[PDB]
mmCIF file of C-alpha atoms and ligand atoms in Angstrom:
data_model
loop_
_atom_site.group_PDB
_atom_site.id
_atom_site.type_symbol
_atom_site.label_atom_id
_atom_site.label_comp_id
_atom_site.label_asym_id
_atom_site.label_seq_id
_atom_site.Cartn_x
_atom_site.Cartn_y
_atom_site.Cartn_z
ATOM 1 C CA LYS A 1 -0.016 -0.039 0.033
ATOM 2 C CA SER A 2 1.183 3.484 -0.954
ATOM 3 C CA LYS A 3 3.461 5.357 1.393
ATOM 4 C CA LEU A 4 2.156 8.632 -0.006
ATOM 5 C CA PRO A 5 -0.248 10.985 1.807
ATOM 6 C CA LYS A 6 -4.014 10.665 1.351
ATOM 7 C CA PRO A 7 -4.181 14.105 -0.308
ATOM 8 C CA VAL A 8 -1.518 13.127 -2.887
ATOM 9 C CA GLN A 9 -3.044 9.678 -3.507
ATOM 10 C CA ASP A 10 -6.417 11.280 -3.914
ATOM 11 C CA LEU A 11 -4.805 13.655 -6.418
ATOM 12 C CA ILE A 12 -3.556 10.649 -8.374
ATOM 13 C CA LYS A 13 -6.999 9.042 -8.488
ATOM 14 C CA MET A 14 -8.442 12.355 -9.750
ATOM 15 C CA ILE A 15 -6.083 12.956 -12.649
ATOM 16 C CA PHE A 16 -6.246 9.384 -13.813
ATOM 17 C CA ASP A 17 -9.984 8.873 -13.645
ATOM 18 C CA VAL A 18 -11.171 7.129 -16.813
ATOM 19 C CA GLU A 19 -14.773 8.097 -16.335
ATOM 20 C CA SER A 20 -13.692 11.749 -16.395
ATOM 21 C CA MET A 21 -12.065 11.092 -19.734
ATOM 22 C CA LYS A 22 -15.257 9.513 -21.251
ATOM 23 C CA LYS A 23 -17.276 12.336 -19.596
ATOM 24 C CA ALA A 24 -15.218 15.099 -21.149
ATOM 25 C CA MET A 25 -15.617 13.325 -24.518
ATOM 26 C CA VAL A 26 -19.371 12.555 -24.417
ATOM 27 C CA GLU A 27 -19.754 16.124 -23.244
ATOM 28 C CA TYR A 28 -18.063 17.055 -26.596
ATOM 29 C CA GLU A 29 -20.790 15.046 -28.341
ATOM 30 C CA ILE A 30 -18.062 12.460 -29.352
ATOM 31 C CA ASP A 31 -19.443 9.001 -30.111
ATOM 32 C CA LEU A 32 -17.664 6.657 -27.697
ATOM 33 C CA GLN A 33 -18.841 3.700 -29.782
ATOM 34 C CA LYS A 34 -17.199 5.024 -32.927
ATOM 35 C CA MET A 35 -14.274 6.564 -31.118
ATOM 36 C CA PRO A 36 -13.636 4.862 -27.799
ATOM 37 C CA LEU A 37 -10.786 6.246 -25.586
ATOM 38 C CA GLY A 38 -8.268 3.595 -26.641
ATOM 39 C CA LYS A 39 -8.845 4.515 -30.294
ATOM 40 C CA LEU A 40 -7.514 8.027 -29.801
ATOM 41 C CA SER A 41 -4.325 8.830 -31.664
ATOM 42 C CA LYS A 42 -1.750 11.654 -31.797
ATOM 43 C CA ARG A 43 -1.476 11.564 -35.639
ATOM 44 C CA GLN A 44 -5.296 11.601 -35.797
ATOM 45 C CA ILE A 45 -5.384 14.725 -33.571
ATOM 46 C CA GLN A 46 -2.675 16.404 -35.752
ATOM 47 C CA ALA A 47 -4.697 15.816 -38.996
ATOM 48 C CA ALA A 48 -7.828 17.198 -37.297
ATOM 49 C CA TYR A 49 -5.851 20.382 -36.373
ATOM 50 C CA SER A 50 -4.827 20.625 -39.987
ATOM 51 C CA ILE A 51 -8.332 20.419 -41.255
ATOM 52 C CA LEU A 52 -9.352 23.107 -38.781
ATOM 53 C CA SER A 53 -6.619 25.376 -40.155
ATOM 54 C CA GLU A 54 -7.847 24.785 -43.663
ATOM 55 C CA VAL A 55 -11.370 25.911 -42.488
ATOM 56 C CA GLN A 56 -9.921 29.048 -40.974
ATOM 57 C CA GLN A 57 -8.173 29.867 -44.261
ATOM 58 C CA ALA A 58 -11.331 28.885 -46.188
ATOM 59 C CA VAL A 59 -13.421 30.971 -43.879
ATOM 60 C CA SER A 60 -10.967 33.942 -44.122
ATOM 61 C CA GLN A 61 -10.782 33.694 -47.965
ATOM 62 C CA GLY A 62 -14.552 33.401 -48.416
ATOM 63 C CA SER A 63 -14.644 29.776 -49.848
ATOM 64 C CA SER A 64 -17.610 29.187 -52.122
ATOM 65 C CA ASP A 65 -19.315 26.605 -49.897
ATOM 66 C CA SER A 66 -19.145 22.853 -50.610
ATOM 67 C CA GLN A 67 -15.419 23.339 -49.915
ATOM 68 C CA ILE A 68 -16.522 24.527 -46.419
ATOM 69 C CA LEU A 69 -18.832 21.482 -46.410
ATOM 70 C CA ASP A 70 -16.229 18.979 -47.682
ATOM 71 C CA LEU A 71 -13.928 20.267 -44.865
ATOM 72 C CA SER A 72 -16.659 19.874 -42.366
ATOM 73 C CA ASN A 73 -17.313 16.274 -43.414
ATOM 74 C CA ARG A 74 -13.589 15.664 -43.221
ATOM 75 C CA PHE A 75 -13.369 16.839 -39.610
ATOM 76 C CA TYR A 76 -16.358 14.790 -38.481
ATOM 77 C CA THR A 77 -14.872 11.781 -40.317
ATOM 78 C CA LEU A 78 -11.697 12.144 -38.256
ATOM 79 C CA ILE A 79 -13.600 13.000 -35.079
ATOM 80 C CA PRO A 80 -16.800 10.768 -34.808
ATOM 81 C CA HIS A 81 -19.629 12.640 -33.208
ATOM 82 C CA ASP A 82 -23.227 11.549 -32.611
ATOM 83 C CA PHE A 83 -25.834 14.095 -33.637
ATOM 84 C CA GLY A 84 -28.525 11.594 -34.659
ATOM 85 C CA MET A 85 -30.343 14.006 -36.932
ATOM 86 C CA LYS A 86 -30.424 17.623 -38.056
ATOM 87 C CA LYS A 87 -26.886 16.912 -39.474
ATOM 88 C CA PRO A 88 -23.567 17.993 -37.971
ATOM 89 C CA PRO A 89 -22.890 21.709 -37.453
ATOM 90 C CA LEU A 90 -21.100 23.451 -40.299
ATOM 91 C CA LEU A 91 -17.652 24.756 -39.431
ATOM 92 C CA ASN A 92 -17.990 28.094 -41.372
ATOM 93 C CA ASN A 93 -16.823 30.720 -38.857
ATOM 94 C CA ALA A 94 -14.169 31.705 -36.376
ATOM 95 C CA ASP A 95 -16.261 30.685 -33.430
ATOM 96 C CA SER A 96 -16.733 27.174 -34.718
ATOM 97 C CA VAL A 97 -13.095 26.405 -35.449
ATOM 98 C CA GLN A 98 -12.119 27.995 -32.106
ATOM 99 C CA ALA A 99 -14.307 25.646 -30.104
ATOM 100 C CA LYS A 100 -13.438 22.658 -32.191
ATOM 101 C CA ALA A 101 -9.753 23.485 -31.605
ATOM 102 C CA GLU A 102 -10.158 23.841 -27.818
ATOM 103 C CA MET A 103 -11.540 20.368 -27.825
ATOM 104 C CA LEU A 104 -8.690 18.833 -29.787
ATOM 105 C CA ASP A 105 -6.270 20.404 -27.288
ATOM 106 C CA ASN A 106 -8.232 18.679 -24.438
ATOM 107 C CA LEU A 107 -8.628 15.331 -26.349
ATOM 108 C CA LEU A 108 -4.848 15.426 -26.844
ATOM 109 C CA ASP A 109 -4.070 15.587 -23.115
ATOM 110 C CA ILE A 110 -6.608 12.780 -22.549
ATOM 111 C CA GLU A 111 -4.783 10.559 -25.066
ATOM 112 C CA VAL A 112 -1.525 11.425 -23.162
ATOM 113 C CA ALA A 113 -3.119 10.452 -19.913
ATOM 114 C CA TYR A 114 -4.921 7.254 -21.099
ATOM 115 C CA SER A 115 -1.780 6.210 -22.928
ATOM 116 C CA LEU A 116 0.064 6.553 -19.648
ATOM 117 C CA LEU A 117 -2.679 5.009 -17.435
ATOM 118 C CA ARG A 118 -2.410 1.994 -19.788
ATOM 119 C CA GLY A 119 1.345 1.868 -20.439
ATOM 120 C CA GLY A 120 4.122 0.248 -18.345
ATOM 121 C CA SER A 121 4.262 -2.788 -16.158
ATOM 122 C CA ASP A 122 0.637 -3.293 -14.809
ATOM 123 C CA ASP A 123 1.830 -6.050 -12.431
ATOM 124 C CA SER A 124 0.535 -6.516 -8.843
ATOM 125 C CA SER A 125 3.638 -5.855 -6.718
ATOM 126 C CA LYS A 126 3.210 -2.083 -6.181
ATOM 127 C CA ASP A 127 -0.224 -0.607 -5.566
ATOM 128 C CA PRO A 128 -1.935 1.370 -8.518
ATOM 129 C CA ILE A 129 -1.443 4.699 -6.783
ATOM 130 C CA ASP A 130 2.344 4.323 -6.467
ATOM 131 C CA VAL A 131 2.812 3.181 -9.979
ATOM 132 C CA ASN A 132 0.739 5.930 -11.509
ATOM 133 C CA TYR A 133 2.481 8.525 -9.230
ATOM 134 C CA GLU A 134 5.739 7.546 -10.831
ATOM 135 C CA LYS A 135 4.430 7.879 -14.337
ATOM 136 C CA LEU A 136 3.973 11.582 -13.628
ATOM 137 C CA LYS A 137 7.658 12.276 -13.206
ATOM 138 C CA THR A 138 6.710 14.938 -10.659
ATOM 139 C CA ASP A 139 7.618 15.373 -7.032
ATOM 140 C CA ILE A 140 4.402 16.053 -5.169
ATOM 141 C CA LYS A 141 4.541 17.172 -1.526
ATOM 142 C CA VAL A 142 1.684 18.433 0.559
ATOM 143 C CA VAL A 143 2.029 21.994 1.867
ATOM 144 C CA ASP A 144 0.891 22.361 5.533
ATOM 145 C CA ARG A 145 -2.391 24.243 6.042
ATOM 146 C CA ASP A 146 -0.794 26.405 8.766
ATOM 147 C CA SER A 147 2.342 27.438 7.032
ATOM 148 C CA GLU A 148 3.655 30.700 5.627
ATOM 149 C CA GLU A 149 3.580 29.182 2.179
ATOM 150 C CA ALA A 150 -0.085 28.171 2.536
ATOM 151 C CA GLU A 151 -0.899 31.474 4.183
ATOM 152 C CA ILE A 152 0.563 33.354 1.213
ATOM 153 C CA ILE A 153 -1.250 31.143 -1.424
ATOM 154 C CA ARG A 154 -4.538 31.355 0.293
ATOM 155 C CA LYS A 155 -4.275 35.119 0.393
ATOM 156 C CA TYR A 156 -3.452 35.175 -3.296
ATOM 157 C CA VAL A 157 -6.532 33.067 -4.068
ATOM 158 C CA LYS A 158 -8.764 35.167 -1.743
ATOM 159 C CA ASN A 159 -7.679 38.611 -2.833
ATOM 160 C CA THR A 160 -7.687 37.975 -6.625
ATOM 161 C CA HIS A 161 -11.214 36.465 -6.389
ATOM 162 C CA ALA A 162 -13.948 39.098 -6.658
ATOM 163 C CA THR A 163 -17.721 39.571 -6.784
ATOM 164 C CA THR A 164 -18.353 41.017 -10.349
ATOM 165 C CA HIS A 165 -18.055 37.333 -11.444
ATOM 166 C CA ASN A 166 -19.067 35.964 -8.101
ATOM 167 C CA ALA A 167 -20.930 33.145 -9.810
ATOM 168 C CA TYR A 168 -19.025 30.921 -7.333
ATOM 169 C CA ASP A 169 -16.822 30.954 -4.179
ATOM 170 C CA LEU A 170 -13.379 29.356 -3.848
ATOM 171 C CA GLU A 171 -12.239 26.868 -1.181
ATOM 172 C CA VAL A 172 -8.622 25.608 -0.969
ATOM 173 C CA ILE A 173 -8.802 21.919 -0.177
ATOM 174 C CA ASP A 174 -5.160 21.052 -0.876
ATOM 175 C CA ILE A 175 -1.958 22.677 -1.969
ATOM 176 C CA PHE A 176 1.028 20.793 -3.235
ATOM 177 C CA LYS A 177 4.610 21.894 -3.914
ATOM 178 C CA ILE A 178 5.518 20.387 -7.296
ATOM 179 C CA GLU A 179 8.809 19.833 -9.071
ATOM 180 C CA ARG A 180 8.784 18.039 -12.410
ATOM 181 C CA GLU A 181 11.887 16.037 -13.386
ATOM 182 C CA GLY A 182 13.964 18.249 -15.668
ATOM 183 C CA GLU A 183 12.003 21.411 -14.845
ATOM 184 C CA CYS A 184 14.930 22.973 -12.960
ATOM 185 C CA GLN A 185 18.060 22.602 -15.056
ATOM 186 C CA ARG A 186 15.843 23.727 -17.883
ATOM 187 C CA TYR A 187 14.596 26.811 -16.099
ATOM 188 C CA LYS A 188 17.911 27.717 -14.423
ATOM 189 C CA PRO A 189 19.237 29.766 -17.447
ATOM 190 C CA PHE A 190 16.024 31.789 -17.527
ATOM 191 C CA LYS A 191 16.129 32.551 -13.787
ATOM 192 C CA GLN A 192 19.063 34.780 -14.615
ATOM 193 C CA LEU A 193 16.440 37.056 -16.061
ATOM 194 C CA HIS A 194 14.446 39.784 -14.277
ATOM 195 C CA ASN A 195 10.721 40.125 -13.965
ATOM 196 C CA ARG A 196 10.084 36.680 -12.409
ATOM 197 C CA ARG A 197 6.446 36.380 -11.201
ATOM 198 C CA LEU A 198 4.128 33.793 -9.612
ATOM 199 C CA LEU A 199 1.150 33.493 -11.898
ATOM 200 C CA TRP A 200 -1.851 31.328 -12.293
ATOM 201 C CA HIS A 201 -2.725 28.658 -14.898
ATOM 202 C CA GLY A 202 -5.984 26.742 -14.767
ATOM 203 C CA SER A 203 -6.806 23.774 -16.891
ATOM 204 C CA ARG A 204 -9.233 20.911 -16.980
ATOM 205 C CA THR A 205 -8.554 18.014 -14.572
ATOM 206 C CA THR A 206 -8.292 15.601 -17.492
ATOM 207 C CA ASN A 207 -5.310 17.520 -18.905
ATOM 208 C CA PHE A 208 -3.202 17.335 -15.673
ATOM 209 C CA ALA A 209 -1.490 13.931 -16.208
ATOM 210 C CA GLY A 210 -0.145 15.275 -19.527
ATOM 211 C CA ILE A 211 0.767 18.706 -17.827
ATOM 212 C CA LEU A 212 2.673 17.089 -14.943
ATOM 213 C CA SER A 213 4.135 14.449 -17.231
ATOM 214 C CA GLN A 214 5.279 16.762 -20.009
ATOM 215 C CA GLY A 215 4.959 20.342 -18.612
ATOM 216 C CA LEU A 216 2.941 23.237 -20.169
ATOM 217 C CA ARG A 217 3.284 23.259 -23.929
ATOM 218 C CA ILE A 218 2.730 25.522 -26.976
ATOM 219 C CA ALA A 219 0.201 24.727 -29.717
ATOM 220 C CA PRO A 220 1.583 22.890 -32.728
ATOM 221 C CA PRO A 221 2.106 24.572 -36.193
ATOM 222 C CA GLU A 222 -0.918 22.598 -37.500
ATOM 223 C CA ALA A 223 -3.061 24.148 -34.793
ATOM 224 C CA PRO A 224 -5.199 27.016 -36.094
ATOM 225 C CA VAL A 225 -4.147 30.400 -34.772
ATOM 226 C CA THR A 226 -7.710 31.498 -34.096
ATOM 227 C CA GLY A 227 -8.392 31.597 -30.314
ATOM 228 C CA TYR A 228 -4.834 32.294 -29.312
ATOM 229 C CA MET A 229 -5.208 36.123 -28.730
ATOM 230 C CA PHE A 230 -1.419 36.606 -28.554
ATOM 231 C CA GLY A 231 -0.044 33.744 -30.766
ATOM 232 C CA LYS A 232 0.960 30.305 -29.808
ATOM 233 C CA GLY A 233 2.445 30.443 -26.278
ATOM 234 C CA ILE A 234 1.848 29.687 -22.615
ATOM 235 C CA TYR A 235 -0.784 31.911 -21.001
ATOM 236 C CA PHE A 236 -0.950 32.996 -17.279
ATOM 237 C CA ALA A 237 -2.979 35.305 -15.182
ATOM 238 C CA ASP A 238 -2.307 37.327 -12.000
ATOM 239 C CA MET A 239 -5.819 36.848 -10.733
ATOM 240 C CA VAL A 240 -7.274 33.504 -9.822
ATOM 241 C CA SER A 241 -10.546 34.712 -11.250
ATOM 242 C CA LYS A 242 -9.274 34.604 -14.894
ATOM 243 C CA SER A 243 -7.419 31.319 -14.575
ATOM 244 C CA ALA A 244 -10.006 29.445 -12.498
ATOM 245 C CA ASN A 245 -12.256 29.814 -15.529
ATOM 246 C CA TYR A 246 -10.202 27.233 -17.437
ATOM 247 C CA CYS A 247 -10.791 24.358 -14.976
ATOM 248 C CA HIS A 248 -14.349 24.256 -16.339
ATOM 249 C CA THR A 249 -16.196 23.113 -13.279
ATOM 250 C CA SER A 250 -19.899 23.039 -12.540
ATOM 251 C CA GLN A 251 -22.214 22.218 -9.590
ATOM 252 C CA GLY A 252 -21.951 18.644 -10.996
ATOM 253 C CA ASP A 253 -18.119 18.433 -10.593
ATOM 254 C CA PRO A 254 -17.199 21.533 -8.395
ATOM 255 C CA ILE A 255 -13.610 20.397 -7.806
ATOM 256 C CA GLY A 256 -10.791 21.452 -10.114
ATOM 257 C CA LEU A 257 -7.091 21.958 -10.128
ATOM 258 C CA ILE A 258 -4.990 25.124 -10.780
ATOM 259 C CA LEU A 259 -1.268 25.628 -11.162
ATOM 260 C CA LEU A 260 1.046 28.301 -9.792
ATOM 261 C CA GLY A 261 4.023 28.837 -11.929
ATOM 262 C CA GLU A 262 7.057 30.951 -11.587
ATOM 263 C CA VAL A 263 7.507 32.645 -14.974
ATOM 264 C CA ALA A 264 10.621 34.521 -16.173
ATOM 265 C CA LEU A 265 8.754 37.285 -17.924
ATOM 266 C CA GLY A 266 11.755 39.438 -18.655
ATOM 267 C CA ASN A 267 11.024 42.640 -20.527
ATOM 268 C CA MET A 268 7.313 42.615 -21.290
ATOM 269 C CA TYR A 269 5.755 43.703 -24.667
ATOM 270 C CA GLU A 270 2.589 45.425 -23.423
ATOM 271 C CA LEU A 271 -0.573 45.289 -25.649
ATOM 272 C CA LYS A 272 -4.205 46.039 -25.175
ATOM 273 C CA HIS A 273 -5.650 44.149 -28.119
ATOM 274 C CA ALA A 274 -5.201 40.675 -29.686
ATOM 275 C CA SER A 275 -1.991 40.320 -31.749
ATOM 276 C CA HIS A 276 -0.504 37.147 -33.243
ATOM 277 C CA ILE A 277 3.267 37.556 -32.595
ATOM 278 C CA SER A 278 5.275 34.501 -31.486
ATOM 279 C CA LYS A 279 8.217 36.660 -32.494
ATOM 280 C CA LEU A 280 8.768 39.287 -29.829
ATOM 281 C CA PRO A 281 10.453 42.682 -30.357
ATOM 282 C CA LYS A 282 14.193 42.662 -29.580
ATOM 283 C CA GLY A 283 14.600 43.140 -25.793
ATOM 284 C CA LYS A 284 11.088 41.747 -25.161
ATOM 285 C CA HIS A 285 10.830 38.270 -23.584
ATOM 286 C CA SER A 286 7.144 37.965 -23.052
ATOM 287 C CA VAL A 287 3.764 39.568 -23.761
ATOM 288 C CA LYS A 288 1.572 41.328 -21.210
ATOM 289 C CA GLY A 289 -2.079 41.783 -22.144
ATOM 290 C CA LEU A 290 -3.288 44.848 -20.301
ATOM 291 C CA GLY A 291 -6.623 44.273 -18.509
ATOM 292 C CA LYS A 292 -9.189 46.613 -16.977
ATOM 293 C CA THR A 293 -8.464 45.006 -13.605
ATOM 294 C CA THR A 294 -5.193 44.412 -11.933
ATOM 295 C CA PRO A 295 -4.101 43.393 -8.417
ATOM 296 C CA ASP A 296 -3.395 46.414 -6.121
ATOM 297 C CA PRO A 297 0.310 46.980 -6.888
ATOM 298 C CA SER A 298 0.958 48.180 -3.345
ATOM 299 C CA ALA A 299 0.055 44.695 -2.105
ATOM 300 C CA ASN A 300 2.728 43.033 -4.241
ATOM 301 C CA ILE A 301 4.928 40.717 -2.258
ATOM 302 C CA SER A 302 8.101 38.730 -3.065
ATOM 303 C CA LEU A 303 10.561 35.967 -2.096
ATOM 304 C CA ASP A 304 13.606 34.459 -3.731
ATOM 305 C CA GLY A 305 13.066 37.197 -6.298
ATOM 306 C CA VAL A 306 9.632 36.039 -7.418
ATOM 307 C CA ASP A 307 6.952 38.640 -7.326
ATOM 308 C CA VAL A 308 3.476 37.637 -5.976
ATOM 309 C CA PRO A 309 0.786 40.094 -7.121
ATOM 310 C CA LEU A 310 -1.790 38.897 -4.522
ATOM 311 C CA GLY A 311 -3.179 42.396 -3.922
ATOM 312 C CA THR A 312 -6.972 42.853 -4.059
ATOM 313 C CA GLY A 313 -8.280 43.639 -7.526
ATOM 314 C CA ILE A 314 -8.471 47.281 -8.483
ATOM 315 C CA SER A 315 -9.119 49.205 -11.783
ATOM 316 C CA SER A 316 -6.018 49.478 -13.908
ATOM 317 C CA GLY A 317 -5.072 52.682 -15.734
ATOM 318 C CA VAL A 318 -6.599 51.496 -19.001
ATOM 319 C CA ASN A 319 -10.172 50.421 -19.751
ATOM 320 C CA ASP A 320 -9.649 51.164 -23.464
ATOM 321 C CA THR A 321 -8.387 47.610 -23.413
ATOM 322 C CA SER A 322 -10.421 44.669 -24.681
ATOM 323 C CA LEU A 323 -9.111 42.478 -21.856
ATOM 324 C CA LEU A 324 -10.768 42.424 -18.465
ATOM 325 C CA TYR A 325 -7.904 40.672 -16.678
ATOM 326 C CA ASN A 326 -4.145 40.728 -17.333
ATOM 327 C CA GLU A 327 -2.464 38.038 -19.439
ATOM 328 C CA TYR A 328 1.109 36.861 -19.554
ATOM 329 C CA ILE A 329 2.490 34.940 -22.472
ATOM 330 C CA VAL A 330 5.907 33.259 -22.913
ATOM 331 C CA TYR A 331 6.950 31.601 -26.124
ATOM 332 C CA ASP A 332 9.584 29.307 -24.646
ATOM 333 C CA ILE A 333 8.465 26.316 -22.504
ATOM 334 C CA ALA A 334 11.616 26.872 -20.412
ATOM 335 C CA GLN A 335 10.486 30.242 -19.119
ATOM 336 C CA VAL A 336 8.129 28.402 -16.784
ATOM 337 C CA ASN A 337 8.857 26.716 -13.419
ATOM 338 C CA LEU A 338 5.721 25.104 -12.009
ATOM 339 C CA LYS A 339 5.907 25.503 -8.271
ATOM 340 C CA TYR A 340 2.484 24.586 -6.731
ATOM 341 C CA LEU A 341 -0.789 22.871 -7.662
ATOM 342 C CA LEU A 342 -4.045 23.509 -5.809
ATOM 343 C CA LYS A 343 -7.208 21.387 -5.515
ATOM 344 C CA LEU A 344 -10.098 23.813 -5.182
ATOM 345 C CA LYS A 345 -13.772 23.506 -4.461
ATOM 346 C CA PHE A 346 -16.010 25.820 -6.444
ATOM 347 C CA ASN A 347 -19.114 26.760 -4.475
ATOM 348 C CA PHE A 348 -21.570 28.119 -6.989
ATOM 349 C CA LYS A 349 -23.968 30.884 -5.770
ATOM 350 C CA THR A 350 -26.649 30.131 -8.350
HETATM 351 N N1 L3L B 1 -5.104 28.650 -19.059
HETATM 352 C C1 L3L B 1 -5.084 29.776 -18.360
HETATM 353 O O1 L3L B 1 -4.967 29.872 -17.061
HETATM 354 C C2 L3L B 1 -5.211 31.045 -19.140
HETATM 355 C C3 L3L B 1 -5.012 32.235 -18.471
HETATM 356 C C4 L3L B 1 -5.111 33.448 -19.075
HETATM 357 C C5 L3L B 1 -5.461 33.455 -20.447
HETATM 358 C C6 L3L B 1 -5.593 32.285 -21.149
HETATM 359 C C7 L3L B 1 -5.412 31.099 -20.412
HETATM 360 C C8 L3L B 1 -5.695 29.986 -21.364
HETATM 361 O O2 L3L B 1 -5.489 28.789 -21.195
HETATM 362 N N2 L3L B 1 -6.070 30.668 -22.529
HETATM 363 C C9 L3L B 1 -6.341 29.960 -23.776
HETATM 364 C C10 L3L B 1 -5.202 29.939 -24.756
HETATM 365 C C11 L3L B 1 -5.564 29.101 -25.967
HETATM 366 N N3 L3L B 1 -6.693 29.749 -26.590
HETATM 367 C C12 L3L B 1 -7.836 29.740 -25.697
HETATM 368 C C13 L3L B 1 -7.520 30.520 -24.538
HETATM 369 C C14 L3L B 1 -5.938 32.052 -22.527
#
């Protein structure tokens, strides 16, 4: 039986839940009879991205239908859905390819996880929890409730959570210190770079095995650019309110996970509107999307050299911005050092 702590073990069970995988799929209207979990493939997901990019181009050009129809059939041939009747939705706009792409991102992480939860020696010497834990290649330690670290984190979560979107309330059930294998010697060279901050990154639970196992990644070339406001990179927030929205929780499954990463921002290229870049200006090492709301700068705290902007949310200088919350994008996976992972309960006000 595992020597790990209940909170950690329970974390393993969460990120490796098959049901959750089939749930996220069925929720996507994916036919589990035509496309069961095991059938999922990386190549297949690549091809699908490519089709979606062709649709974007078609949509942008103003393709004379049929071609927009043939591309739609193609995508639904690759990704088997069950509509029954009324026919599948036509992918003929930005909105459609955007959503279809977000799903492929998720489906990708599910394949990564299922491929892991099914790979390796499935013997009976070590217990399932221990085996799986290893597959993650991540050191997971529980952070004491009554500790300076926990105190800080809880304050960061409490302050950056407001009422203008008070559709729910946040409860920190567990906080873990995390250190992925490799993520250290890879980040080292970037630590010798100013503007290092502790930012948020929320994601569906089903994507966490792939995140811990392979770290946060950047969309592939084949992936359509629509949706990525500031190009293909890694996105973070300084307010749990913006990040917590990517955990996609509901009163049905009120529990989600959210990361806390130390990001070497360097000199930030500040923008107020979407802008595909990837290629920053000389001297710029990241992008900062200016939001209408920022954490009170006077409340900024630090440690080790990492700034924690846990100050309560105030109104930034600019409202001429399209963004409501700030956004931080880095285009090099090594500019990120994941530090903590939180298990949070979302209490919806309804
Ligand atoms: N994940 C986060 O915490 C997060 C935080 C801030 C902004 C964004 C994300 C995120 O994931 N964003 C997506 C990027 C891909 N295109 C859809 C939107 C934008």
